[model samples]
Target: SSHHHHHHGSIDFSNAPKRLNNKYPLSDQKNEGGWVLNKKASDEFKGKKLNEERWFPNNPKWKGRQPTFFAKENTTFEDGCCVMRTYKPEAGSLPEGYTHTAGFLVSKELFLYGYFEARLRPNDSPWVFGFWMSNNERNWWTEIDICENCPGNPANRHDLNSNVHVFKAPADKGDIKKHINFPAKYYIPFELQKDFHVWGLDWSKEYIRLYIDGVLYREIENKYWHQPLRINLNNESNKWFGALPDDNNMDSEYLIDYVRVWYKK
Candidate 1:
């Protein structure tokens, strides 16, 4: 309660673009709403250690995708950034069904309708670096993928993926299992693993807008993604992420500069 927040680090926007450049439907000024920072769901990682009460280093329910476990010790903070490592492990007792290990960070709170930011870089490994949100529920599952990337692979080196899903929803709520999926891929010139850039999302009841370095890139209609979800920053292997790096002998790291969230007031 006594510390000042330096979430926006000192970086002159000489290289990265600045401010939202909305177009088309978002061009209307009234669409812009007042926002208040939601402190509990945001963190700059400018501390020697994670603020444990607000962030959990591992997901308690999901060990991870096959072959890669979410190793709590794989995550560390350095230079005001959260570094999450992914690698093949050896000579130790690993959880069953897991031959490798990576990192996971989850917020303790669930959030609804808001604008969020995560400035991050994917690893050099062919594994997937995910900045997303979700909730586990028996009747339904809500997922908002801000960015799902595999920047090390050549074909995907510049491709960024965004998705929203209402998987396994109740029969009356919407489609079940095959209910919904809004996926978009953007091809940009920059290699995502090389440096830090902001991935942002403005989620409202009517629409969801994706942004890159404050520039609005894509927009999607919102149909069923209204539930509260927890934020997740994690690394895991995905077959869809292309061929495994070096026959799965992977060693790489994902770095995140900061994560901020704001609620519409």
Candidate 2:
């Protein structure tokens, strides 16, 4: 007998934008924007601005020690590859009432299509772990979370294993009603700190397609109208009142070798 994985809603597979093949459009001969944060400008922070703090600053009002920036350094000229490091951020408290800054960047200045793909290793923590995309200026006009893995329970670090949590917002940005989490049994096969595998998203005006290591993981029919795209990387430790826990020493990093974007014709 044959068995299969069942998904609830109807999935549109015919309209998916082409997979990332050799023919995809590459970044132009010269970078148009010269590399800057998608929404927040570079000059907003102090020395060594990481842009993570600026892009997702818990407190943008109270001027404080800004995070450091270690922009992606090209690893090899052959593949035009680059790597971004997640340093153990400074452990501290917000000024009065604010959260610590987290999250990094990707740009809409370069490409536009609903879907995106980036290969990275997530911190195997009890908290959220995934790559996210959104319209840079709309404040969650349309958002997509490709993979959100909860290790389950507050104690076990590397025991519970699964590929889960892929969802989208038709319009609900901050509300839970606007979001939906993919079933826990969905298989994307992600591992922490081993080998790099490609995660691809195919997007259009009517549906969104997700691919893990070239296999379809999950697809949603709700599409974004004026949805632009931005790439983000983050490992948010559970914090309260925006204070970074001093004892929260999880020595982990999210590494990426290359990020190639595909735009529709």
Candidate 3:
């Protein structure tokens, strides 16, 4: 199920689209690049809490003020997986006006080109389960959405979106000026919520590929490809996607078995 495509010849940067400087190699083990195992950069989530050295909870303030309040209280490690729970905010859970609360985790380490993969089982909620990477700087606003899903509607439960975004001006001026997105709906018979599936991103200077269960789902030609980015995992509820259900008592969860990143050897 390896979808390996090697880059040869010249790259067209004429439409460079402005950009992040790469901190890692543009290749990995499966392709022409070498990739050696780095145990310290991998997580199995076998314990009751995430290893602090690798990940920080509720650290990405960019997504902080939203339909859901990001809090460490919403994340838990149990049964060998890291679980992100989304629920109706309690009386004192948030400061004053926020209503929903959910879990958010960001990698302390930054990565450039390479391979990043995670095993996730998206919850059946109106919220979005996201696996993305960003430069973490507001001025840059460079992001790659490896996976984003909303399974609230049973008929469109398998729909997923992958995107590449870049901004010409600082985010305060214009959030995203240039972007490319690919939306897909899998034809598999089973619900995406019923089982844990591997979602992956193969990033290089030449291209970025999104995969589900080792099968390539979408590919984007690399343009603004040179920034070191941090991984982000969160469950978010926002108006742009859709409104949440009226049922306030229902609890939903986003579960992650592990997150692994590779670098060229």
Q: Against the unseen true structure, what C-alpha lDDT does each candidate score?
A: 0.75, 0.39, 0.68
lDDT of candidate 3 over 1-265, digit per residue (tens):
1111121222222333221212222222234446654477678899797788888878655545455778888889999899988767656766665677778888888888878888898877777788888874645657888876666545445445556767443445444566534333334445667788777788898899876665665677776656778888888775544635335534767899888787666
Candidate scoring better on TM-score of 1 and 2: 1
RMSD of 1: 8.9
Residue range with the least summed lDDT across 10 consecutive positions in model 2: 69-78
Clashes of each: 0, 2, 6
Pitting candidate 1 against candidate 3, the one with the higher TM-score is: 1
Name the best candidate (by TM-score).
1
**TM-scores for candidates 1 onward, in order:** 0.84, 0.51, 0.78
Candidate number with the higher lDDT (1 or 3): 1
**Higher-lDDT candidate among 1 and 2?**
1
Every candidate's CA RMSD: 8.9, 10.3, 9.5
Give the CA lDDT, 0 to 100, for residue 20 in model 3: 27
Candidate 2 residue-wise lDDT at 132: 56
lDDT of 1 by residue, 212-253 (tens): 776677788887887889999988878766735354546666
